[PDB]
Design a protein around this motif. Structure first.
Motif, short mmCIF file in Angstrom:
data_model
loop_
_atom_site.label_atom_id
_atom_site.label_comp_id
_atom_site.label_asym_id
_atom_site.label_seq_id
_atom_site.Cartn_x
_atom_site.Cartn_y
_atom_site.Cartn_z
N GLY A 377 0.83 -1.19 0.00
CA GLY A 377 0.00 0.00 0.00
C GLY A 377 0.87 1.24 0.00
O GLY A 377 0.41 2.34 -0.31
N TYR A 378 2.15 1.06 0.34
CA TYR A 378 3.10 2.17 0.42
C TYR A 378 4.42 1.81 -0.22
O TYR A 378 5.45 2.34 0.15
CB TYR A 378 3.35 2.57 1.89
CG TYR A 378 2.09 3.00 2.60
CD1 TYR A 378 1.25 2.07 3.19
CD2 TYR A 378 1.74 4.34 2.66
CE1 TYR A 378 0.08 2.46 3.82
CE2 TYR A 378 0.58 4.74 3.29
CZ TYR A 378 -0.25 3.80 3.88
OH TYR A 378 -1.41 4.19 4.53
N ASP A 379 4.40 0.92 -1.22
CA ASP A 379 5.66 0.47 -1.78
C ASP A 379 6.31 1.49 -2.71
O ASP A 379 7.46 1.33 -3.10
CB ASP A 379 5.54 -0.91 -2.42
CG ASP A 379 5.52 -2.02 -1.37
OD1 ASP A 379 6.18 -1.84 -0.31
OD2 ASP A 379 4.87 -3.05 -1.60
N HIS A 380 5.58 2.56 -3.03
CA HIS A 380 6.23 3.70 -3.68
C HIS A 380 7.22 4.38 -2.73
O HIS A 380 8.22 4.95 -3.17
CB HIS A 380 5.21 4.71 -4.23
CG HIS A 380 4.32 5.32 -3.19
ND1 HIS A 380 3.59 4.57 -2.29
CD2 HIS A 380 4.01 6.61 -2.93
CE1 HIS A 380 2.90 5.37 -1.51
NE2 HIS A 380 3.13 6.62 -1.88
N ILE A 381 6.94 4.31 -1.43
CA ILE A 381 7.82 4.89 -0.42
C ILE A 381 8.93 3.92 -0.02
O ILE A 381 10.09 4.31 0.05
CB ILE A 381 7.02 5.36 0.81
CG1 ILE A 381 5.97 6.40 0.40
CG2 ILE A 381 7.95 5.97 1.87
CD1 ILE A 381 5.10 6.90 1.56
N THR A 382 8.58 2.65 0.24
CA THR A 382 9.61 1.69 0.61
C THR A 382 10.65 1.57 -0.49
O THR A 382 11.84 1.37 -0.22
CB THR A 382 9.03 0.29 0.89
OG1 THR A 382 8.52 -0.26 -0.33
CG2 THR A 382 7.93 0.36 1.92
N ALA A 384 11.16 4.05 -2.96
CA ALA A 384 11.80 5.35 -3.21
C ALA A 384 13.09 5.47 -2.42
O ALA A 384 14.07 6.04 -2.90
CB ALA A 384 10.87 6.50 -2.87
N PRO A 403 1.65 2.85 -5.36
CA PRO A 403 1.10 2.34 -4.10
C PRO A 403 0.35 1.02 -4.25
O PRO A 403 0.15 0.33 -3.25
CB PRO A 403 0.14 3.45 -3.67
CG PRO A 403 0.73 4.70 -4.27
CD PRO A 403 1.29 4.26 -5.59
N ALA A 421 7.05 10.11 -6.72
CA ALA A 421 7.99 9.49 -5.78
C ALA A 421 9.33 9.19 -6.45
O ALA A 421 10.40 9.36 -5.86
CB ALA A 421 7.39 8.21 -5.17
#
Ligand SMILES: [Co+2]
Ligand SMILES: [Co+2]
Lengths: 472, 472
Positions: A377-382, A384, A403, A421
């Protein structure tokens, strides 16, 4: 549907005109000019968004036509930017990229000739605005497009490319499957100003009705030629998934997660035969150098969990990627190498060290990497975090992650979130490498911030309307 | 308002019971158990969410009461965890933290005694579930709360803490300003199971009606005692903003961005007098060791733009932070140091190198850092990259950053986005440091992923309902 003007208030699309000395062709290299207040000079940024408001049924202007026609009339045994570079020739493509990167044309020629940069630019993709991928240049971002849950019209299909590039995508991969692959890819190519890549094993699999065991070199060969004729700029080919590497994955937590890698592994295991793309590598090179299709040597054994990062299987394939890279260079075929994957931060340096040495500094192309598995759900952040770090160490092209990774298909909000991202990660890497003039962007925005020039601050940002709405 | 059960389907709140040998007190250390399918063992995770469904008018159970009462009856010259640690005493707080971190109580005592970890635990914050901050422990996350655009009720005020901790915040700072600072901070403390910090210069400024020039030691002193009496666990004090460092900021792009740093600088410049918190450092220590308030030595000269990162002013203050740290330790006062800020990735290592050496490995507490200035609206991402990197290098507490940074006040969606991004950064850092058992979380989720145990995958994630909704 927002327009360019609505996405980037106070920006205009501009072109820098330069003359290609050798041919006399005039090139118009795009950029975006952000107009500022309070006596600040306008700020010029990179622009991949391409020509605006063009009817998709007509397609983009064939800006490269006179370049390709002239080279055909002169006559040449090979058509690749690497071949031209090794002959000491500075092409329109090289000059265009040099201008776009604010660097010397000879430097671009040198980087391409030595294999440390590529200009993915199939002679049949006449609509392409040339761009370069390499450690010595701006870090670039790839966005993927594919099947929507419901069949798309031409306007809807082309909008996927227009949307991703509006936010900064530098390349696209068309990963479509199903019964209309050729037709929709035609719509994309004739309407894309950025390079378009594919994974040709996907369409070859569809030609044999989804039965991996019925693949072979011959149907793969036909698929490669079909795609090259349309203008595909690069092919992901998983030729490093060797038969003897498959058992190295047996103790993995998430096994083989690459779809192309899985297809090749299934075929190899069914027959106990060596990978047919590996066996026919030379024949693939013969195809590529008539069109200039760049080869993105796949990592079919990329790690799909933190547990599997940097394992024996992953690095076995990396070694073969290096062999295939050097072999491609012998025939003047442009090459990049694909990389992980899921990799925790402390294992990132080893990845770059081994790739730079074993693959002779060919450009590297990563998916992330994702630095932890705990936040779907947040793998754009993990990812990045990983992309910024591996980019800082020299990775040249970053495949974005939205995401929706691991969960479902991305909508337009998801795609935008992913591209933003990744533009953040790519620019953070540019700063970390002390790439010339990169900090000027940060400095302009921070100056507007200090001086309370709010509209200027928003106009200078990656996503002006989000900043403006958040403030209001 | 979602409940714990709705935020974390398949999770239960549990407690590990241990006996404090010295006193016979029974401690109940919280954790969250995620119940899995397919014969997988349940997975136990850290839990800061605290007691659920407690009436805010009543407040939380005073779980530390018998601990504090016993120590008062025994009699002691100082009340700090560092003082107890140096005497060779393992307190309830130390045992509680050791259990929560799955480490040895003697190791916790050692880390606290040497100043390399702190347990922020004012004896007046009886509601606190003890936690530890230090490089040898799990990387921790701070969330900030403050004024809403419209005055909050008690339930609304307390919900800010309940919400941030539900998603994983390990500490809170109450940064409220205005006419009701004392009353709302009372509501927060009596209803917070996590440590609560403040920046006391904010309230001291309000006591002199917003006129920085009318501040002085005396009103600051009164403010410190008032806040200590209520139970504040740590004070950010910008005692390193020395008069002679102010001119070092003259050539900066964004100047002094710290609000507390700005207040002190204004006062110093008005009178040409040395910082009164610096001058009265010893007197501040006398206050702290009667309550055990930890000192978070501020970085009032933190860089507010990439341009200003790692400049002479920033490091001048860092040197003084080290002096103040060693001085505090002489009086057994627990210390952490605050750090940047906006710092590009290549400048991050220097930050950690200098802090570890100059401040004798005291725990470090950063805001990010933000790795680029180009994306307001996404500074939770620009800073997650920095936070993960500086955390990997040893930073112990990460102050979160929401998508509203530089733009406006965060709503509940913004706060959640910020906490999730920071839990990602903190855990990615745990993995990078090879912190014991950290990868077990990733491995459990990835195992569920490989085996198509979707509900298990969601239940194991940082934000189960987002993962589930995205999939559906
Ligand atoms: Co994956
Ligand atoms: Co800032």
């Amino acid at each position: 549907i927002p327009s360019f003007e609505e996405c980037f208030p106070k920006s205009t699309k501009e072109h820098k005109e330069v003359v290609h000395e050798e041919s006399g062709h005039v090139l118009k290299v795009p950029f975006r000019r952000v107009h500022l207040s309070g006596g600040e000079p306008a700020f010029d940024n990179y622009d991949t968004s391409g020509p605006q408001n063009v009817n998709a049924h007509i397609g983009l202007a064939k800006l490269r036509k006179e370049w390709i026609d002239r080279r055909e009339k002169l006559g040449t045994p090979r058509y690749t930017q690497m071949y031209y570079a090794k002959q000491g020739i500075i092409t329109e493509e090289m000059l265009y990229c040099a201008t776009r990167e604010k660097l010397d044309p000879e430097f671009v020629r040198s980087e391409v000739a030595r294999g440390r940069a590529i200009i993915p630019s199939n002679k049949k993709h006449l609509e392409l605005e040339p761009m370069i991928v390499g450690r010595k240049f701006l870090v670039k971002v790839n966005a993927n497009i594919g099947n929507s849950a419901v069949a798309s019209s031409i306007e809807e299909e082309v909008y996927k490319v227009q949307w991703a590039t509006m936010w900064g995508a530098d390349t696209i991969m068309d990963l479509s499957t199903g019964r209309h692959i050729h037709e929709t890819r035609e719509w994309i190519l004739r309407n894309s100003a950025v390079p378009v890549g594919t994974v040709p094993i996907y369409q070859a699999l569809e030609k044999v009705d989804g039965i991996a065991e019925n693949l072979n070199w011959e149907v793969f060969r036909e698929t490669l030629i079909e795609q090259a004729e349309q203008g595909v700029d690069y092919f992901t080919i998983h030729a490093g998934v060797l038969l003897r590497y498959i058992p190295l994955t047996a103790k993995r937590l998430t096994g083989i997660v690459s779809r192309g890698g899985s297809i090749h592994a299934k075929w190899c295991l069914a027959y106990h035969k060596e990978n047919f793309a590996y066996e026919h590598w030379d024949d693939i090179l013969d195809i590529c150098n008539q069109y200039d299709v760049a080869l993105s040597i796949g990592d079919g054994l990329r790690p799909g969990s933190i547990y599997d990062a940097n394992d024996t299987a992953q690095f076995a394939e990396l070694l073969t990627q290096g062999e295939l890279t050097r072999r491609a260079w012998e025939k003047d075929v442009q090459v990049m190498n694909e990389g992980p994957g899921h990799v925790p931060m402390h294992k990132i340096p080893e990845n770059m060290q081994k790739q730079l040495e074993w693959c002779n500094e060919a450009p590297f192309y990563t998916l992330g990497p994702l630095t932890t598995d705990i936040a779907p759900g947040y793998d754009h952040i993990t990812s990045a975090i990983g992309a910024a770090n591996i980019g800082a160490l020299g990775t040249a092209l970053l495949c974005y992650v939205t995401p929706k990774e691991h969960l479902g298909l991305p909508n337009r909000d998801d795609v935008k979130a992913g591209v933003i991202a990744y533009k953040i990660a790519a620019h953070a890497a540019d700063l970390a490498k002390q790439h010339p003039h990169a900090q000027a962007w940060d400095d302009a925005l921070s100056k507007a911030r200090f001086e309370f020039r709010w509209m200027d601050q928003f106009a200078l940002s990656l996503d002006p309307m989000t900043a403006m709405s958040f403030h209001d």
